[PDB]
Amino acid sequence: RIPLQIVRAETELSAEEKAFLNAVEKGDYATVKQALQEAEIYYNVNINCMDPLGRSALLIAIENENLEIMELLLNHSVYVGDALLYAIRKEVVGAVELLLSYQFSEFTPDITPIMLAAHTNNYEIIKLLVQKRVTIPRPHQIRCNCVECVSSSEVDSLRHSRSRLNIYKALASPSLIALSSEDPILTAFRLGWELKELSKVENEFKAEYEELSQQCKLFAKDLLDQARSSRELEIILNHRDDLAKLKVAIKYHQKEFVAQPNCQQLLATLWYDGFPGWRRKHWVVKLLTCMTIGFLFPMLSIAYLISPRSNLGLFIKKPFIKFICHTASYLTFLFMLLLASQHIVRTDLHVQGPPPTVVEWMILPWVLGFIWGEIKEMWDGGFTEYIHDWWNLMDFAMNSLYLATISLKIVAYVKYNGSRPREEWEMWHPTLIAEALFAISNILSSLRLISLFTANSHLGPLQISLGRMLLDILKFLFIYCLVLLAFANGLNQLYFYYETRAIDEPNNCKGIRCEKQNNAFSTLFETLQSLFWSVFGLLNLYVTNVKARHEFTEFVGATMFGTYNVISLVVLLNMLIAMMNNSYQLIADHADIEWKFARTKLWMSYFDEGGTLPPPFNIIPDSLIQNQHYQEVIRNLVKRYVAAMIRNSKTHEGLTEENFKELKQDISSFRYEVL
Amino acid sequence: TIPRPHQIRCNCVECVSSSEVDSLRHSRSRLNIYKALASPSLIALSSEDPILTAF
Amino acid sequence: RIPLQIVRAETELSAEEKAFLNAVEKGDYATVKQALQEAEIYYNVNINCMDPLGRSALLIAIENENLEIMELLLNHSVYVGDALLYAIRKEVVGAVELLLSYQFSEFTPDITPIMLAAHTNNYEIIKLLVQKRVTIPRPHQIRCNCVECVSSSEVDSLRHSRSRLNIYKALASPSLIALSSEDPILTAFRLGWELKELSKVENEFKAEYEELSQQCKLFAKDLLDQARSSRELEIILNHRDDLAKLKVAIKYHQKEFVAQPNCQQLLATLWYDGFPGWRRKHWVVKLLTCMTIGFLFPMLSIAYLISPRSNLGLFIKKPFIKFICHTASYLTFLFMLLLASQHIVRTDLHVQGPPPTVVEWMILPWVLGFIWGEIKEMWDGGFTEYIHDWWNLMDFAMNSLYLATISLKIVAYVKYNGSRPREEWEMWHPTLIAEALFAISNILSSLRLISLFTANSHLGPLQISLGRMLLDILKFLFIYCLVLLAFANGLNQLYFYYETRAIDEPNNCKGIRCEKQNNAFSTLFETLQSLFWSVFGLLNLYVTNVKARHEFTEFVGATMFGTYNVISLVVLLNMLIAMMNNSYQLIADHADIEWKFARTKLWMSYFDEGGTLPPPFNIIPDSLIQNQHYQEVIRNLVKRYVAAMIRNSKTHEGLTEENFKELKQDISSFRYEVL
Ligand SMILES: CC(C)CCC[C@@H](C)[C@H]1CC[C@H]2[C@@H]3CC=C4C[C@@H](OC(=O)CCC(=O)O)CC[C@]4(C)[C@H]3CC[C@]12C
Ligand SMILES: CC(C)CCC[C@@H](C)[C@H]1CC[C@H]2[C@@H]3CC=C4C[C@@H](OC(=O)CCC(=O)O)CC[C@]4(C)[C@H]3CC[C@]12C
Ligand SMILES: [Ca+2]
Ligand SMILES: [Ca+2]
Ligand SMILES: [Zn+2]
Ligand SMILES: [Zn+2]
Ligand SMILES: [Zn+2]
């Protein structure tokens, strides 16, 4: 028996106010008029009476979209505050125009009429409001130590965050950008960048800021989509405040703008400069032409040096031929790196400091060219973006290992004279370190070729997904390294008392890299190595067996080894499978825009004159007219976009409501004509 | 008023006998009562602490 | 310049027919009347004129849902054939009633009005048609060699298939089952079973028949869902043409009907017969009670034998206690099987024919009980469903291996007298075969416990998914066995010339089960074994190396081994991963209905009196009233279902169309009143 009563009692109005509110809601030109006259004379009705469910007389008159009752209430001095916002949110032009011609609320007090109009994204209401000289407060910069931001955040943090989000939502509407900004493309780019960088700062309101940034990027892409000619697209892309706006969009990570089909057409025509209709030809003749131009890599580079402006000197200046020549030079470098480890060119293996062979003497200009190119990349173009590549770390590692190999070879040549057999050299002979670093640099140089996958149409998205899933490999190795450190600590602590010597063990071998694996858990480094190698099954089971008859210690060690194997394989590897499968499933939707953005960024790196020579040969010693043309193009694009959007806003629901309103008005007019 | 649903673990006669005589009607009545009590409007009107009532 | 003309010219009517058709379409009581009078007198208008887009005057009058023009056209002798079907498909009651009161077509000639009414599933139209004494032709049985089916399929197969599908779609409508059938539950069960079995026969029209079977099953479940009392549910489930209708639904594989919550309540109350509120208690006290009743398994079975109808004799007759006693007896059997291979009970290991030990003497009554229970299961209950279990094959294998072990032990006892050490016994000594078959039967008996997973709430759907993915394991092993046979044939053909002898090889071992693996590909059986064991990495790499210096043969053999490893692991295992992941994703939706059906089928196997004793102790020596009650229950359920369905058929579209029709009729009536 649960008793049910209204615990929050609302002060109900008198019966005289109910008649006035019912006359307002039903709609009557005479009953409301005489009710207001009686309220003026006898004071029977409070004019500012309000329903318990937040509905004043003016709000109900707005909800009925009738202008006569609204005009009479406006002339009868009804409380008009917080009533234009309801008409704006209802999105009716007549009521907003009438209220602009002159307690409880459903809107937060920081909302202005222009802000709500921008939130509702109605073109006519926003235009009619901005004609009345309205302004929006400027949101502050993200990192503020000023008093006006810090004190406001300290006093009322929720109101501050709500006000900032409301302002940024008002500024990000496509209609307000199309009306109030003279450069909607650059405004959309900038607002998308600020909203994306601000979503990470305000990590709790991340979804709304990400949605607003996506809205701005979509508006920029849709504004570019309305181009009806190649001249308009060339004017858009070449506008400088060669392809300036495309470089700006690449800077602001506008992947949807970059991967637009007409932008990709213009980039493809600029890429195949010397080949009219490269996509037209057969794949066999394309492969033959690519092979010929690649095999002509000593050519077209000497000709550039001896005659830059000849018939043949301008052949390498085209971007595709430049890319082919660079790829051919790198493949030739890797071929000589393969040839450097062969018996035909490498002899006299028992000298402490050897002079370089012919293959290494040929390798040296390539290494100097790579070093000089990476040095020039630090200066030319800039330094703040050189580290913002994530491929230049690999190049820096390659060049550092090359320099270390060269320096160690020089030291071993100048301080070691004579010959000595290789078995009696010391552990840290400079020659051995040089041969190790050269091999590591060979691995890095041959793995550098993955960056060329974005040019191909089939290996590009594959490399994009490879990066996507390496981002989760990086997360998985933290848990794996914690588990590895835990079990290594435990196993070394259990097993370090039974450490033997290399002399006692057979073949003078102490470690897990022997025929009979010895001292697998004796030291912490060897324990880490053993627990790493047990993942691939290369650690045998008898390494947990000690010389003495300590069967309890052996059993506890084998149990630790089995628990580590279970945790590190059965749980963790299949967890990694599930993680990468989920990440691949998410990225497979947006996998072609990313590849097209990466391919575009690779294409614009070959457009400029800098770095024309391959690394073998790169070490051998009025604005008003453009602004007005862009302004006409923007005017046409904005008009086309606003027309397409304004009738794409026509909806079955709104059309149906409009038809009922027109039918009701016409029936009432016909009834008044008959009566 | 709405009848109060019993506690989950009842050995009382009024619950056990009702479940024995007609189990389907008993389960339907309990589910209907708990569906009536869980509506947001009834919590907003009849309860003075809607947050704790919802919890 | 592609010329565009109408290649299929349609004979357009004269301008006099256009006026008549426009007057019919617009709606005019006077223009159509005078047009028909002029057509009667001057023969200016053909009354049966037809639009090019398949629209006669009567069809347009049907589309306008106006009965006056339809009545005048009916009185004016307009061609009425193939016009009731349009009114039925449009689903308007008045036009169908009026046309029932008296070239090109959009309907196939095998469609009758009752069949189209059943296809549209409108209750009022189906009722109004079945009141007029209509019949539906009976579809034939699935396997017909009769002339009337074979000749019709030979002359016109497409028409025959379309007619059969149309008839079965008309018979499967819920409204026709609710009206024309006195037992809608049994009719829905039977029709669902025939449609499911006919979907596999007509493998091309499989989707439609499967959809119709699902529709019938959904109708049966929804008819059961309208029960408002436990008495009605007990009347439904106990109706015999104890739980008879539940057994019928289990026979017809009605998983949705079985897994209904009220059926599961009734089954759960019948299952926990001696425990009022088993789900109420704590899990600890539940485990303690289950452990006590299980450990009392010698008890409650001797008491059943000495006093079946005592206080304690009826305790095991309850289903849950019977299940607990059976599980305890099986676990005790497995415990003695574990004890049989221990040194405490097994001694004198060098006798050719041993007498049985005490553990095997205790095992023998259990084996005889299992054999007698499986023999009784063949006779009691039936034989045609004993093979339709897929668990009785395992039981038959266990009992056959048990019988073979007993017979071999008897033979080895009666023909081998004396003692001999185990190393000089022959390869096929009967004792060794007995010990092998006993171990295989031990493996099978301990793996038999998987069938008890459906009782638990967490391991049931897991076993359902295990069966789901074993169904794809079975598909994968065909490709794997084909690849294995191919590579085994190739490797044996390459390597059989270098076969050695066991004497020449070290330790007199010839095979891959030695310390040094020898002759891995010498014979076809050993090649199959080697290629099987290479999947788990237990085949070493030096088995591809021969004694002679035939490096080309060794290289080709190693290349075959590597290709087999790549195909059988990198492609095939990850393909199997993808297949089972997809199958698990599909079955994870319908994974709880399957488990509840399996748990119900396990529960009804303990309800009957047969097999009350555990296998240790099972070898020790008026219908009119029920029909009328069921008829009242069906009447109430059908009325509730048809009310719920008939206003669930109310839709925004139909209500909106009805409101426009009423508004148009009222406005026309008001205009006629004014005029
Ligand atoms: C499988 C083994 C033999 C590979 C050995 C390494 C190289 C010989 C391969 C690896 C990556 C390959 C590259 C991957 C992608 C491309 C881009 C591709 O670009 C185009 O097709 C041009 C048109 C466009 O840019 O879309 C031209 C071949 C090339 C340089 C490939 C040349 C050959 C490379 C360097
Ligand atoms: C992990 C190792 C130690 C398992 C060794 C084998 C047995 C000791 C296990 C395997 C399967 C188990 C069974 C799995 C499922 C069930 C059903 C379960 O049923 C209930 O909970 C009763 C209520 C209901 O029917 O829903 C009772 C325990 C039982 C028989 C389990 C008893 C113990 C079993 C036989
Ligand atoms: Ca670089
Ligand atoms: Ca059985
Ligand atoms: Zn600030
Ligand atoms: Zn109670
Ligand atoms: Zn027939």
Swiss-Prot record, chains A, C:
Changing L655I: Found in a patient with mental disorder and obesity; uncertain significance; no effect on protein levels; does not affect cell membrane localization; strongly reduces channel activity. ANK repeats lie at residues 14-44, 53-81, 82-102, 109-138. GO terms for molecular function: actin binding; actinin binding; ATPase binding; calcium channel activity; clathrin binding; inositol 1,4,5 trisphosphate binding; store-operated calcium channel activity. It catalyses: Ca(2+)(in) = Ca(2+)(out). Activated by G-protein coupled receptors via direct interaction with GTP-bound GNAI3, which increases the channel sensitivity to phosphatidylinositol bisphosphate. May be activated by intracellular calcium store depletion. Calcium channel activity is enhanced by MYLK, that promotes its subcellular localization at the plasma membrane. Disulfide bonds join C509-C514. Residues 282-316 dip into the membrane without crossing it. The chain crosses the membrane at residues 320-340, 361-375, 390-410, 433-453, 469-491, 560-580. Expressed in brain with higher levels in fetal brain. Found in cerebellum and occipital pole. GO terms for biological process: calcium ion transmembrane transport; calcium ion transport; negative regulation of dendrite morphogenesis; nervous system development; neuron apoptotic process; neuron differentiation; phosphatidylserine exposure on apoptotic cell surface; positive regulation of axon extension. Keywords: ANK repeat, Calcium, Calcium channel, Calcium transport, Cell membrane, Disease variant, Disulfide bond, Glycoprotein, Ion channel, Ion transport, Membrane, Metal-binding, Repeat, Transmembrane, Transmembrane helix, Transport, Zinc. Residues 1-281, 317-319, 376-389, 454-468 are cytoplasmic. Zn(2+) binds at H140, C144, C146, C149. It is a multi-pass membrane protein. Homotetramer. Heterotetramer with TRPC1 and/or TRPC4. Each subunit in the homomeric ion channel (via ANK repeats) interacts with one copy of GTP-bound GNAI3; the interaction is direct and activates the ion channel. Interacts with TRPC4AP. Interacts with NHERF1. Interacts with MX1 and RNF24. Interacts (via C-terminus) with CABP1. Interacts with SESTD1 (via the spectrin 1 repeat). Interacts with PLSCR1. Interacts with PKD2L2. Belongs to the transient receptor (TC 1.A.4) family. STrpC subfamily. TRPC5 sub-subfamily. Forms a receptor-activated non-selective calcium permeant cation channel. Mediates calcium-dependent phosphatidylserine externalization and apoptosis in neurons via its association with PLSCR1. Acts on distinct neuronal populations in the hypothalamus to regulate innate behaviors including feeding, anxiety (flight/fight/fear), socialization, and maternal care. It is linked to Loss-of-function variants in TRPC5 may be involved in a mental disorder characterized by maladaptive behavior, anxiety, autism, postpartum depression, extreme food-seeking and hoarding behavior, hyperphagia and obesity. This is Short transient receptor potential channel 5. It comes from Homo sapiens (Human). The chain holds residues 17 to 758 of 973 of the full protein.
